[model samples]
Target: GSSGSSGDAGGGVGKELVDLKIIWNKTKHDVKVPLDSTGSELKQKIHSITGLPPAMQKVMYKGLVPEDKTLREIKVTSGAKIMVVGSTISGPSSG
Candidate 1:
């Protein structure tokens, strides 16, 4: 069942986060995220890794990865390539 989304196998939040590395042939961004972490968490990590604002990061995988979703919910793994195609940081803002 989808109950495997959280606290599965390990049965506790004390479980160590999995070592994940995203390498995309799209841009210069390598994010480290745990298999149990949610997409929103991953996006935050991505922002720290690239200095791109969370609102401006267009996270792309097989489709637009929902921020509120977890990696397990989306079936994401260690070798997934999350490409940051378009970014608002490409140029300075006019405000």
Candidate 2:
């Protein structure tokens, strides 16, 4: 005798949280985001942490990621090192 219920695969939208280490300029900001989170969404989190505008934010995972792609689509995994490249908006050049 065997207990037979139902067989299924892990079929569902990826909503797993990925912990990413965002390095910007010389600082580190640990960010936790869902796998389904889009590139733009990640930028918003970075904006809050670094106070940088999303338009000026450039994210690099395995390579330069676009704003329309999601973390899962980009294959971003936990404990991954994400490089953030952007300059803070200043009124004028610091003299």
Candidate 3:
């Protein structure tokens, strides 16, 4: 399991923030994430904003990104455009 801490790594710090554009099924959302934030965390962030589960999110930058890797490791720069694909669970409809 990943760390569930709320943005504090015990004072190991950097205030640098990166802006990103996340596009999901034609819907767009712009967000700021720490450069050290991992792909998994990014997915969680998206889940909060988009209401799509993190498990269902396939975050695409140049290609599929590894959840364990940080944005800096992936070389995700500021103002980057990321594409995401996922679906939300919905109530069954009458047939």
Candidate 4:
């Protein structure tokens, strides 16, 4: 039986915030801000070039490989933001 608080699974939001603070501290040392384009625009540009399927695009956004943690890190050149699409997945055998 689970005895933890409903919202404190593994690490709570505070812990996540703390982790982000640490990451931001390290990242600010080298990365530059004010990116020229937005994340959505970047995604659209990639889709245009590769003609990747919508499903694949969603996967690309959600599928974060270990290498991606470092390779895909982006420092916003401008004040642009990213809008992520929501989705749900079910097992093949599930109803």
Candidate 3 lDDT, 1-95, residue by residue in tens: 77665563466565668888888889767788788888778877777777766667678898777777888887789887877776664332572
Colliding residue pairs in candidate 1: none
| Global Cα lDDT for candidate 2 | 0.75
What are the models' TM-scores?
0.58, 0.67, 0.69, 0.25
Per-residue accuracy of model 2 over 1-95 as CA lDDT, tens digit each: 77768776876776567888878888877777777888778877777777766667777777877777887787778887877777756332462
| C-alpha lDDT (0 to 100) for residue 93 of candidate 1 | 82
Q: Which prediction has more favorable lDDT, 1 or 3?
A: 3
Cα error of candidate 3 at position 31, Å: 0.6
Local accuracy of candidate 4 as per-residue lDDT tens digits, 1-95: 86765553454342110111101112211222223334444444434433443334432332432322321344321322222333342222452
Residue-level lDDT for 87 in candidate 3: 65
Give candidate 3's total backbone clashes.
0
Winning model by lDDT: 3
Off by over 4 Å in 3: 1-15, 87-95
